[PDB]
């Protein structure tokens, strides 16, 4: 098994970089009732500071237009939709990790598009027109929300320009130019606004080295580096879904650690580094996302990810998505932490559990994190992800946890194949694509962790915990100080109740 | 164990008389935010039709007042509070099972009072004035709610008049006179208004014989007989609480059965019989009410009480109560199905579980009830009350349930000593009297039945249910047809996901 | 002025056909938070039973798709969105007046499209697949909401086929076929499902005749005739808006009266007549919709339309629209009764005012309507639209209304250029395109009718009302019985208060 | 009329001391639903920082109890209720201006009580037991809310001890002893908790000179001086209401000033001064509270009171009151800014209007206040209370206001006998005591100020306002820069709309 004696002291800190940002489907979808109810719901449980998605300039949001009169053609920047979208974000208490893109059609130099909703991925016909659009939007943001607010919004230029699907011909140089023109337009508005990139996907880090060298040699400002991370191997789509083998979380933490080094060996060694999008599979139709395995797996990344990066946004917070058309079933492998109808997937609870962690990191290994909060209470999280099939997926634990107080109240939350696994149940129901309200209700009741309370006696400043982790289980223990008030109950004696 | 083969048909039906009416603390408390929130919470889970409680005429509600102009004394009827209370009841979707009482101070003949809030319990100094009061109030309900709504309200006269604590000297003669004047006044406003009594507690059923014969020989209107029922032996209060031995459910059931028989053998053999108030203990400070035990014990009463009475009102719906002063801790043995801070007790889920029962009663025995719904689905409810210390409380079950389909989706809900037991957690916390918001949150999360789902196949029209019931457990099983859609998912194969 | 003595009684009735249905932007938009909040807000004030809009089969809702397996093209029906859309409707208490259309891209024969959102308007490439899509959809509805529910939904086939914009070549022949097939496939699902058409716009009434003869001769089912009505003359769009002279309401009423005759003269003389879409201007950018004029104008139609049709649906209920792109300002001449940010336009209150109408019509002329409600109270609505430019816009009135009671309470509500005119205030602010929260709040405070109360003593069963209507005003007078309680207050005397 | 030229200059500030605190009925009522919804309502409209009322220790809240075990009698402090009350207050965002009192029954030395709810007005039998109570309560507050939070709560000792009705025999010396014991108990808990008194009503300011002198001689700590002020003369109660002449606001403002000077000449010259209770009439049944008069009257105090005091709390925020038994009609002369059923009274809008004032005072006199906000926009409030019967009550105005912009947007709000006067409408209904839902709805609709917008151009930095103030009217004018966007609407032209 795994015997562990948690140190009573430690000089390691656990930050909340894991909850800095969360991803989302294109901004246009944010106008949806379903989208907003779910965002509010997530924010009532996980305090994400930012939310990052594509589509700010896409035509459904409808910002860039052009009015034609016999005499001239002049641009018209329409803010009716983003005002509403950004107004609701600020109301909910979350800020946009703005992504500049994609190319509105009236400015497109080409016709290439991406996804079901067809965002244009070609450079602008006229870079100056693109520069004025960016400034027009920035000035509108300042006008409506004030410069103090907007200055907190980082601006990421484009998305995965290294892939021919998001950027015409994967033209590295044209990207650097787009970045230059955009960065200059933003800075012109206000020199303190944060700009960055290159928002590339893995397997092309020579882009980050080039990107940084370009900003250096061309004297172009950069306030942060962005990149994406996935651990899913190549797969084969069916007209409904796709399966991909997920490599261990080790490969992702290593990619983090690797690109971090590239930034420190570059001309801008202290640049903050954001993983603006990550998950196991990079497909919005891969079943693994809705499983308990996904939640046990992500656990470690939330545990160690912050050691190498400034943030890492989980893609996504909801199944309200469309890159591959409208979802066709209650569970379809969406990126969402929360499935449609506000049904939290196990992964949702992994994030929820980390909300209990303190800054003092007493102990940590590849399958367990132990911290202490301000008040002195101790929280512990352990996970048991099953990478491949086996007959011994169980793992026993015995941990000695240091505790200030003598009397302890214990609160244990758990999720695994039988607890907080709405997916398994949906399978019991016959995988309905469009369940009834009664069925969705049963899925909500099921989608909750198991809660168990107890009390022990901490001896010489320590408490011994023994537990077993089933297949793909994630557990959260909280040890707070118990202050017994039983003596104040005159005549208290439970044994005088029938059977106790 | 307990092997049972449930029949395909039966000549028995199961009514919903078990949810006709529920009890409440004095009406004046309906003015509380805590009270209304809680009532709305119960109604969202249990479709109670009526709500029965004391205090309609008590001075906190303030209906009866007297204005003095010189040496003249004119009465004044203030409807400000009742209007707000009854307005809030009808808005929530529940009607009052009116209880005419107690005695307004200005109309009292003596000074004897009952409870911490001192409801005067002496007859009126002038039965005329009392009669006018009764008529003034009804004409107001009529005037504000319309005769059509008020005709749906029954009017029970007084409360347990056979006890000297609730009616001076337990004067049976004066009560019969009280009843005559009151019933007469009611009928005069509108003879369709249901009036009844005698509202006595157990151990004095001769009071009913005397009552009925009093009406049958005095031609006094009577639309229903009401009585209370408990199974708790005399106990001895401590300044904080009291314990009492609770007897088996048989006693209460046989009591329902006895009195029901005292009526069929009466001069009004067809009068409806209402148990306007029941529970294990008749004390608002008996810890037994907050236990899983209570939940299991009342389960059988819901299953059979309907056979003998037109309705039985569990006392009460909430711990918002003040008979023995303001509650002094999160759990204090109050009558409520719901503890303060809207924390449902296990008995709450016993009622909740019965909502799954259909009208077709296929099988039933002292510890189990099986029914079929309109759509063919079948539901089962078993309970295991452990009425005494025992090294072994567990019970084994094996039930063959007839099902008109082969593929079955199973939804199981369980409450016992480790599930849906906020009381057990409260103790784990050191029995906090005034718990913080985090504690109350923990209690709320624990206070939920364990939901568990599965899917098996039926053989020879029978689905075999094998399960054991732990200490004081209550389980719900709903078996519905599983209509599998798994075939419409192209490429579907969970084995292609890590570990699966 | 206009002196009118309202007849003591009458045998004519005012029906609520005016509130039977209301229009809406494309169904896909019903997914919007703004849409839903607005629909609920409307339904709390005006009880519309049905809602009519296009886009049911348009690809944004996404019902029709095609899976490519190997070399076989299998059709797929995705209900994720209409299920969410129709649930919200039914949840709110409003049913869809279904409109079958337009052509999903995959089944489209041509490439022609209409509107900013490109709804394909060509016939199907295979009328078989069309019929199968139709039955697939209907069955699902049946399966999800039950046949008893789906039976209450009428089915309109396509939209204004008599116009090249919505139907390729306005081919009258094809429409009759598409209708034959569609009206058939529906019936095959269930013979009681109401079907109708041709839902043409005014001017081409020859279509209704050729339609009612097509059915008769080719033996095609028909349960209703649908047509649209508009009184706006042609105009010339600027890239932002359009102005159009609006003809008098008389033109519209005459058309209702006309087309209704064509039906009573046809083979189907008892067919119901539905005006599934009407308003002054048929453009979503004609400022007239946002004005006090548009409200005093529509008053007379809500007042008389019912005399000729089974229903007439105001297009639309909200400015949440996109036919001509995303709106570019708080007021942009949208069809809505309610402007974005839930700001009611004066027309909204014209409908609202009609709720006060009883069924007993005592009087009515081109500018007034007086009805008596069941309880006896009387209600009056008078409107003064200013059609052209004049220098004497105001109108004086003197109406003797028959009043059952002797003491009257008068509640007067009024809207005009100075009251309930958020548009005028919007102008005072400088016509802001994207108003701040404070400005929207001011618009909301302003967007309400003026309210005045008073009290008169009816003499000889009649009450004399002298009022003055300003430019484009619409007023509501409710006359309920006044039962004075002042005498029950001992010492009551306002003169004993400073200055009274 | 009155002609005023507001100087474009400011040497004095206008603070928000007017909204520092508001009054309330006894704490035990804070448990009512009506109460809380109303407190939330008021807070959404006025940012009151504190709320001050009686009954913290009274027995309905029930903190002080005594358990009798055998012979030994042990005190028990039950926090169930205040915990709920103060939880609700902090949740809403308003802190308690704690008033220690009255005397719990079991600790009383005498039998004298005050008000319908009978709060005990005699000194404690044992000052040590009272001292322990104070400590227990404070220690609990710290335990539940944290020290940082409780340190912001001021502690006023008792209420109007100078009156025989609230303090047995108006024993000045016994009150100073009560203050010392209490203050010392408070300071024992925490040295920096704010304590003060004497909370006397007018006419006995020597209690104040004696109070400060007592604290000096006995070295008893004191942090503030509290006092009450009313301007109603003697009246003669009827069993239902009371009338009293209200003296000019000058009287009250001069009392604030007189007492302020007394504190300055004491041993503690810099002590803050709080008027913990004020209004016109001090009776919870004097109709003046509900009239427009009261609104125009209070206007001047809100305007000048902050000049002499650190706060002045209007008694009360809501009609939820019981001092003189449960209210008996929709309007009854309650102290509330808001009447039952959340119907704001005119005074409510006087406070609401003051939210508009900025810190820069530009002009002020007995009937007008003009200030400038931080963004440069200007606000003006003028009032015209009619102190006595008159045929000529109106008051005309011409005010020249300086504005830094040329294009001005004007928002004007007005309450008077005809606008926002629910009392007036209520009378029109016959003065119903228990209005129907419909009538309550009509009053709510009337209970709003008249809103009117417009736009003028200033001439040489000045805008001229011309208006007439009706009887008891209060007007608010907000002038903000008008930034016209009309030029961006291509083809805009309202004249192209029928009648425009
Ligand atoms: C990163 O990979 C996942 C995909 O859904 C995102 O759109 C892309 F940016
Ligand atoms: C019935 O017993 C319980 C008690 O609380 C009730 O008041 C009584 F009527
Ligand atoms: C009827 O005219 C108005 C337009 O918006 C609709 O689309 C059309 F059917
Ligand atoms: C001050 O006068 C008004 C009364 O209602 C308060 O109780 C008193 F303190």
């Amino acid at each position: 098994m795994i015997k562990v004696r948690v140190p009573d002291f430690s000089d390691k800190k656990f930050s909340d970089r894991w909850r800095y940002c969360v991803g989302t489907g294109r901004l246009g979808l944010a106008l949806q009732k379903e989208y907003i109810e779910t965002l509010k719901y997530v924010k009532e449980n996980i305090d994400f500071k930012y939310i990052r998605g594509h589509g700010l300039l896409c035509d459904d949001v409808g910002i860039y237009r052009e009015d034609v009169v016999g005499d001239e053609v002049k641009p018209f920047y329409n803010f009716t939709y983003i005002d509403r979208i950004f107004d609701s974000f600020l109301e909910i208490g979350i800020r946009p990790f703005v992504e500049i893109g994609f190319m509105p059609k009236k400015l497109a130099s080409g016709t290439q598009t991406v996804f079901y909703w067809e965002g244009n991925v070609t450079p602008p016909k006229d870079y100056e027109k693109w520069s004025d659009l960016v400034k027009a939007v920035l000035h509108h943001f300042i006008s409506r929300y004030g410069i103090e607010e907007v200055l907190k919004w980082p601006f990421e230029i484009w998305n995965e320009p290294n892939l021919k699907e998001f950027w015409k011909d994967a033209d590295e140089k044209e990207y650097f130019k787009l970045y230059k023109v955009t960065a200059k337009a933003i800075k012109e508005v206000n020199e303190n606004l944060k700009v960055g990139g290159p928002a590339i996907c893995g397997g092309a880090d020579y882009w980050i080295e080039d990107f940084l060298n370009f900003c250096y040699e061309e004297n172009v400002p950069v306030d942060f580096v962005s990149r994406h991370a996935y651990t899913s191997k190549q797969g084969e789509y069916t007209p409904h879904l796709i399966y991909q083998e997920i490599m261990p979380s080790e490969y992702m933490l290593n990619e983090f650690k690797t690109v971090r080094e590239i930034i420190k060996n570059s001309h801008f060694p202290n640049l903050p580094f954001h993983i603006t999008e990550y998950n196991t599979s990079y497909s919005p139709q891969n079943p693994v996302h809705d499983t308990p395995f996904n939640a046990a797996y992500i656990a470690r990344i939330l545990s160690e990810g912050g050691d190498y990066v400034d943030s890492f946004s989980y893609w996504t917070f909801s199944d309200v998505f469309e890159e591959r058309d409208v979802p066709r079933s209650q569970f379809h492998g969406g990126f969402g932490l929360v499935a449609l109808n506000m049904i939290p997937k196990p992964t949702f609870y992994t994030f929820k559990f980390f909300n209990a962690m303190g800054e003092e990191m007493l102990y940590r290994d590849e399958h367990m994190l132990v911290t202490r909060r301000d008040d002195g209470s101790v929280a512990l999280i352990a996970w048991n992800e099953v990478m491949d099939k086996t007959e011994n997926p169980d793992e026993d634990y015995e941990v000695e946890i240091p505790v200030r107080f003598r009397d302890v109240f214990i609160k244990r939350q758990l999720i695994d194949e039988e607890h907080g696994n709405p997916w398994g149940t949906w399978i019991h129901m016959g995988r309905p694509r469009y369940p009834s309200k009664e069925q969705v209700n049963t899925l909500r009741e099921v989608a909750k962790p198991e809660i168990m309370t107890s009390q022990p006696v901490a001896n010489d400043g320590y408490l011994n915990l023994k537990f077993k982790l089933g297949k793909n289980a994630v557990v959260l223990y909280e040890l707070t100080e118990r202050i017994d008030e039983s003596s104040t109950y005159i005549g208290l004696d439970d044994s005088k109740i029938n059977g106790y």
Side-chain angles (χ1 to χ4, degrees), chain A:
Chain A
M1 60 169 72
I2 315 167
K3 286 184 177 180
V4 172
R5 190 169 170 69
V6 183
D8 168 274
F9 73 88
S10 180
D11 288 304
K12 296 180 285 68
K13 297 299 179 192
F14 181 66
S15 74
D16 55 7
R17 316 273 248 309
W18 64 274
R19 55 147 77 125
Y20 181 76
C21 184
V22 67
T24 170
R26 73 165 197 288
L27 287 188
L29 300 180
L31 290 166
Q32 267 181 35
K33 176 181 179 288
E34 183 83 10
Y35 184 106
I36 295 299
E37 312 171 311
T38 305
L39 211 216
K40 287 180 176 170
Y41 167 67
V42 169
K43 277 285 287 185
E44 301 182 308
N45 293 276
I46 312 174
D47 193 4
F48 289 120
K49 284 295 306 79
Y50 292 83
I51 181 157
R52 185 270 192 184
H54 322 303
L56 168 68
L57 299 183
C58 287
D59 301 302
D60 57 320
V61 171
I63 296 170
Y64 194 75
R65 257 28 159 198
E66 268 178 39
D67 295 325
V68 174
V69 299
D71 181 68
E72 57 164 347
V73 181
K74 56 205 167 195
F76 183 96
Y77 311 104
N78 186 29
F79 303 105
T80 290
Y81 277 169
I82 16 75
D83 276 8
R84 193 194 301 179
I85 289 162
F86 280 8
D87 274 5
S88 47
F89 282 179
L90 292 206
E91 178 183 288
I92 289 180
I94 197 172
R95 303 189 191 307
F97 190 119
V98 191
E99 171 184 337
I100 305 306
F102 294 119
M103 263 293 320
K105 283 296 188 175
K106 281 282 168 280
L107 295 180
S109 63
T111 56
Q112 192 188 321
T113 62
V114 66
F115 300 141
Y116 155 78
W117 38 283
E118 297 164 345
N120 192 298
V121 300
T122 68
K125 261 284 183 294
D126 189 349
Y127 274 95
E128 258 305 84
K129 293 190 178 173
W130 162 267
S131 180
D132 301 326
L133 193 209
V134 167
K135 297 175 71 177
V137 174
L138 290 182
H139 286 312
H140 185 70
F141 285 160
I142 308 300
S143 175
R144 167 163 286 248
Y145 311 101
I147 185 60
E148 173 156 278
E149 176 57 46
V150 182
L151 279 166
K152 309 175 179 186
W153 307 354
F155 298 77
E156 189 188 26
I157 314 311
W158 214 255
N159 185 74
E160 312 185 315
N162 56 308
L163 301 183
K164 287 164 47 274
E165 312 82 281
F166 292 89
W167 186 231
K168 180 175 184 167
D169 302 312
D171 195 318
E172 190 182 0
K173 287 194 68 293
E174 264 305 272
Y175 171 64
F176 291 163
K177 172 170 179 161
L178 198 202
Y179 181 80
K180 184 198 303 171
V181 182
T182 297
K184 179 174 302 172
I186 294 168
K187 293 302 176 179
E188 277 182 56
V189 173
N190 187 295
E191 166 180 53
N192 296 311
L193 290 167
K194 303 168 294 180
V195 66
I200 59 181
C201 52
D205 291 310
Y206 72 90
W207 263 68
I208 288 172
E209 299 180 59
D210 295 337
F211 173 59
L212 293 177
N213 282 325
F214 167 75
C215 295
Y216 182 70
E217 283 134 60
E218 299 304 295
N219 302 291
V220 177
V222 271
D223 305 299
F224 72 79
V225 177
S226 75
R227 182 191 190 283
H228 300 160
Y230 288 89
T231 47
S232 63
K233 280 171 130 289
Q234 195 82 179
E236 195 53 278
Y237 274 104
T238 82
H240 289 177
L241 38 69
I242 188 179
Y243 295 95
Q244 302 162 289
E245 180 189 359
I246 292 69
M247 299 172 277
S249 67
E250 263 299 302
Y251 288 55
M252 184 185 280
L253 294 174
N254 286 329
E255 276 177 43
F256 281 12
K257 177 153 44 185
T258 303
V259 173
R260 219 311 177 307
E261 194 61 0
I262 292 185
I263 299 174
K264 291 200 282 192
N265 291 305
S266 76
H267 288 292
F268 305 85
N270 309 306
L271 285 184
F273 175 33
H274 305 286
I275 297 300
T276 53
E277 123 181 6
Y278 85 94
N279 205 162
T280 47
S281 163
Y282 50 65
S283 170
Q285 294 176 312
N286 183 325
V288 69
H289 294 314
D290 315 311
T291 68
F293 164 72
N294 202 254
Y297 184 93
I298 273 56
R300 190 187 176 189
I301 300 172
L302 295 195
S303 176
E304 292 172 46
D307 296 332
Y308 321 95
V309 306
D310 282 273
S311 87
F312 42 117
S313 176
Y314 185 88
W315 188 265
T316 63
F317 86 97
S318 168
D319 270 355
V320 177
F321 211 72
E322 270 192 18
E323 297 181 344
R324 295 187 67 85
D325 221 318
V326 180
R328 290 138 78 134
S329 55
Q330 184 50 268
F331 284 98
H332 54 273
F335 290 123
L337 278 178
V338 180
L340 305 178
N341 288 306
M342 288 189 284
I343 294 185
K345 303 180 189 175
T347 302
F348 169 81
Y349 289 108
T350 295
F351 279 75
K352 179 67 183 302
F353 286 179
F354 275 74
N355 265 293
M357 302 308 266
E359 313 161 64
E360 277 185 279
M361 184 179 107
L362 301 173
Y363 177 77
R364 184 182 60 172
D365 63 35
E366 287 191 43
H367 293 279
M368 174 169 56
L369 204 191
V370 175
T371 69
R372 187 161 55 198
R373 304 82 157 283
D374 277 305
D375 63 3
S377 62
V378 175
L380 177 162
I381 292 171
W383 47 96
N384 176 215
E385 75 300 320
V386 188
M387 284 303 131
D388 183 283
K389 194 174 180 183
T390 66
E391 288 185 60
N392 185 181
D394 292 3
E395 190 54 75
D396 286 78
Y397 285 72
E398 196 174 306
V399 195
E400 309 201 67
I401 299 77
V403 178
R404 167 198 307 173
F405 31 106
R406 57 186 60 199
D407 207 17
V408 184
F409 168 61
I410 300 169
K411 180 179 178 185
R412 179 188 195 263
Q413 297 184 62
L414 173 280
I415 57 182
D416 59 7
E417 298 298 333
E418 278 91 70
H419 308 86
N421 183 194
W423 170 60
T425 291
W426 168 76
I427 295 189
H428 295 159
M429 299 177 171
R431 299 194 174 77
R433 285 177 176 281
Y434 318 110
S436 62
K437 289 176 181 176
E438 168 66 42
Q439 293 178 302
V440 170
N441 177 65
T442 294
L443 282 176
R444 195 186 305 294
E445 280 166 345
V446 165
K448 289 189 174 171
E450 180 189 62
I451 273 68
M452 282 190 276
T453 62
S454 53
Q455 46 153 170
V457 181
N459 180 47
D460 299 317
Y462 267 77
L463 195 183
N464 186 294
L465 270 196
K466 287 182 179 62
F467 54 91
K468 172 171 290 190
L469 292 190
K471 173 187 178 178
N472 292 321
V474 179
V475 72
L476 193 225
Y477 276 96
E478 283 176 298
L479 321 194
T480 57
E481 184 162 8
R482 185 176 185 274
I483 286 183
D484 191 29
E485 292 179 48
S486 307
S487 65
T488 64
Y489 297 79
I490 302 175
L492 182 279
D493 183 26
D494 291 344
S495 75
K496 288 176 188 171
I497 308 182
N498 277 65
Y500 300 90

